[PDB]
């Protein structure tokens, strides 16, 4: 048959081949050209401080032992042949539990050119650590890294390079975005050397720049807190003799702010420093507490336990209580100070 020629070629290539030895062992440095096609940038987990990414990871090198002459210029072979030859032992330095997909078959391809050039591509899902600083949360930006290199071979044996110019060697698919509360602004690419106990190794690095979206936390945390502050300040417009009503205002607003403060930190990890949202919630709590203390101060100076009746008349300075000066000043002071605080906060943090 016509396929017996290729069987003979493949048998000749693997005759005497030793996959335990890299190409050019003891003669030259094996050079591997790598690049990445991100099919989808997975979701970011703030609690675990990590992210997921799905990639076509492809490498290319030269093996003089695998050159041939035949009717075809390039052999596109079954992926099991990749187990019969030497391949680089690339690994992700900051990688957590990762997956090499093998449904239905191993998601790999190997192609051999007549001059001995090997191309080797494989589909991966990588979970990688992204250490985050959350001082400016929920208005923070991050540069999540992705580092890879050889596990066993030092720089004197294996060196990595980008296939094309480094900016163009990491390509993100247009529709490949699984981010919910982040925007992928872009990426930067670099390479370097890392020392360790075993030796010096080449490391290839990418940094993806992410910007958090603020809408969810605006709806979830900021708006309820602002409404609670306004609800607390509403009590200044009631008559001073309605003690139970204003007490109910104060206690309910304080409890609402306490519950919001407790529930606002559920998403994040248990960091030891205060975020921007913590400062906002603390200031709102101070405002509602101040409103309750203002009511207590007003009540301390109330003399008569009965409110004004709709028939009599109050002479100016059966007598009646006068409207509190503290309330009349608070109606102006509290909203104005809250507005000034909001201006300062949203000016300093959004334009940071």
């Amino acid at each position: 048959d016509n396929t017996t020629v290729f069987t003979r070629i493949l048998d000749r290539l693997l005759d005497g081949y030793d996959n335990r030895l890299r190409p050019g062992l003891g003669e030259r440095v094996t050079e591997v050209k790598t690049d990445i096609f991100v099919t989808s940038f997975g979701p970011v987990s703030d609690h675990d401080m990590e992210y997921t990414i799905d990639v076509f990871f492809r490498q290319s090198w030269k093996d003089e032992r695998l050159k041939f002459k035949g009717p075809m210029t390039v052999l596109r072979l079954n992926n099991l042949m990749a187990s019969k030859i030497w391949t680089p032992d690339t690994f992700f330095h900051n990688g957590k539990k990762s997956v090499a997909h093998n449904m239905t078959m191993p998601n790999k391809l190997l192609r051999i050119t007549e001059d001995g050039t090997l191309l080797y591509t494989m589909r991966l899902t990588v979970r990688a650590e992204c250490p985050m600083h959350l001082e400016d949360f929920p208005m923070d930006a991050h540069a999540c890294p992705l580092k890879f290199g050889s596990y066993a071979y030092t720089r004197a044996e294996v060196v990595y390079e980008w296939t094309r110019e480094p900016a163009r060697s990491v390509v993100v698919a247009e529709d490949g975005s699984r981010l919910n509360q982040y925007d992928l602004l872009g990426q930067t690419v670099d390479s370097g050397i890392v020392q360790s106990s075993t030796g010096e190794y080449v490391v290839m690095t990418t940094h993806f720049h992410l910007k958090r979206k603020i809408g969810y936390f605006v709806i979830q945390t900021y708006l309820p807190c602002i409404m609670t502050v306004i609800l607390s300040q509403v009590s200044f417009w009631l008559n001073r003799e309605s003690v139970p009503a204003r007490t109910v205002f104060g206690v309910t607003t304080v409890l609402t702010m306490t519950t919001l403060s407790i529930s606002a930190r559920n998403s994040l990890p248990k960091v030891a420093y205060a975020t921007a949202m913590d400062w906002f919630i603390a200031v709102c709590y101070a405002f509602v507490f101040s409103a309750l203390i203002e009511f207590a101060t007003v009540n301390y100076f109330t003399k008569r336990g009965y409110a004004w009746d709709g028939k009599s008349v109050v002479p100016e300075k059966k007598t009646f209580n006068s409207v509190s000066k503290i309330d009349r000043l608070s109606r102006i002071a509290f909203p104005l100070l809250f507005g000034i605080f909001n201006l300062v906060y949203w000016a300093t943090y959004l334009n940071r």
Partner: protein, 344 residues
């Protein structure tokens, strides 16, 4: 005669090169595909994916596996699939998948006299599905499964749906607790990557969400507290404690309902339809409480001034209460009419 079949199979497997596809240097090999859907489960908005169990069957022709003298379609033990070439089919949007393996690997290989091969697997796959929840819970979603060859380009392999539109079966028998499958589609095309062009098949479903659960869970309670907030308009103006407690309880209940409703979903940055409805209800109850506050102010902080000196008129609490009684239900009904007309 079992010996003759054994010799025939041994002859077929002798000298068989698994590394080479059928017609390695020849034209591309055509692979037909069909699917029998067993179940769809766990359509998760939090994870943005769905689980799918199926019988996935592939059909092709291998001249090297042709035999004669046995008028039968030889069904063989599935382990022989390890010794034959099969397509390197894969799913791009799959996240986690496996082949069921009890009691043995649920795999089937069947040969025919003319070298035709039928290869079936039982696969459970969790496929990604990005959802647009702007019209949630009155939203329709499109969820797809991509099928592609990894190593073989269009010069080496070709995919087609075996049986045309009947290539996928069992969709009508699927039952989801929260969705109804209104339509499914089959598409065949090509996709180009830096390594070349590859064939692709695509199986898409359109899912429509059921609304009864949210009516029972979310909308009716919100309407109930909104109606309850209007009871304050019938209470006497001097009973400040009762009216204030009623308004505060309604406002806090609305806020708690909104928060606990939004906490069971992904942290999306945009507003949903149900968020709009809950915000409207919050505005209504807040306006009722502010209406009582305005009534109390206009009475107490302005009666002495009016006495010393000397839409409805802004000097009578009874007029304001009657106006609120007339206007609040009407405006709420108008808001409901507009909201339900827009989103349906």
């Amino acid at each position: 005669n079992m010996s003759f079949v054994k010799e025939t199979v041994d002859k077929l497997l002798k000298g068989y090169d698994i590394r080479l596809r059928p017609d390695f240097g020849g034209p591309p090999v055509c692979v037909g595909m069909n699917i029998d859907i067993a179940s769809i489960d766990m359509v998760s908005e939090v994870n943005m994916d769905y689980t799918l169990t199926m019988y996935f069957q592939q059909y092709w022709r291998d001249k090297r596996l042709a035999y004669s003298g046995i008028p039968l379609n030889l069904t063989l033990d599935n382990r022989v699939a390890d010794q034959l070439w099969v397509p390197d089919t894969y799913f791009l949007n799959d996240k986690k998948s496996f082949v069921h393996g009890v009691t043995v690997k649920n795999r089937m290989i069947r040969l025919h006299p003319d070298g035709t091969v039928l290869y079936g697997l039982r696969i459970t796959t969790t496929a990604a599905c990005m959802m647009d929840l702007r019209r949630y819970p009155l939203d329709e979603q499109n969820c797809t499964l991509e099928i592609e060859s990894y190593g073989y380009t269009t010069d080496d392999i070709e995919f087609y749906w075996r049986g045309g539109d009947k290539a996928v079966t069992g969709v009508e028998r699927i039952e989801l607790p929260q969705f109804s499958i209104v339509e499914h589609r089959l598409v065949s095309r090509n996709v180009v990557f830096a390594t070349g062009a590859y064939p692709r098949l695509s199986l898409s479903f359109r899912l429509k969400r059921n609304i009864g659960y949210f009516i029972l869970q979310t909308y009716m309670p919100s309407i109930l507290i909104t109606i309850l907030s209007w009871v304050s308009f019938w209470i006497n103006y001097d009973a400040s404690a009762a009216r204030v407690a009623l308004g505060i309880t309604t406002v806090l209940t609305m806020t708690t309902i909104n928060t606990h409703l939004r906490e069971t979903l992904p942290k999306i940055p945009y507003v949903k339809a149900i968020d709009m409805y809950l915000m409207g209800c919050f505005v209504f109850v807040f306006l009722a409480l502010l209406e009582y506050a305005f009534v109390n102010y206009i009475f107490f902080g302005r009666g002495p001034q009016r006495q010393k000196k000397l839409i409805p008129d802004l000097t009578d609490v009874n007029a304001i209460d009657r106006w609120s009684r007339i206007v609040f239900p009407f405006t709420f009904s108008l808001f409901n009419l507009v909201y339900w007309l827009y989103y349906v």
